[PDB]
Amino acid sequence: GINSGTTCSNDLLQPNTEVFTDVCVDYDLYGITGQGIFKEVSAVYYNSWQNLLYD
Amino acid sequence: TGGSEIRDLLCVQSFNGIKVLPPILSESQISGYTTAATVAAMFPPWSAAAGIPFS
Numbered sequence: 001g002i003n004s005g006t007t008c009s010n011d012l013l014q015p016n017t018e019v020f021t022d023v024c025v026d027y028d029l030y031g032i033t034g035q036g037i038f039k040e041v042s043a044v045y046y047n048s049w050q051n052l053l054y055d
Numbered sequence: 056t057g058g059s060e061i062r063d064l065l066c067v068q069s070f071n072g073i074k075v076l077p078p079i080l081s082e083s084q085i086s087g088y089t090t091a092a093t094v095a096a097m098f099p100p101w102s103a104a105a106g107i108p109f110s
Contacts, residue, residue, distance in 0.1 A: 035070070037057060039057070039058070039059075039061070055062065
């Protein structure tokens with residue numbers, strides 16, 4: 001199944017780049033990367049499949 | 056400038072561009088001016104009371 005099916009190569013640019021951030025560097029995850037300083041905090045209110053929240 | 060209160064609408068207004076400039080006169084000196092006018096009305100010489108005692 002050339003260029004079809006389900007089993008697809010991830011040998012393009014993989015964006016899963018686990019880089020620690022505590023300076024003004026944009027992220028690489030859900031949502032469009034705007035300006036942000038990363039304040040690492042502990043929370044419990046995330047559950048199920050809830051990574052992001054809006055106001 | 057860093058820390059807590061991620062719901063901070065006044066500075067994300069400033070981060071988006073709109074800045075509420077402070078007025079060019081502080082309220083301390085304006086309140087002192089109003090106090091000075093009131094005690095001028097209450098004490099001799101009564102400049103704010105046309106030279107007449109309050110009672």
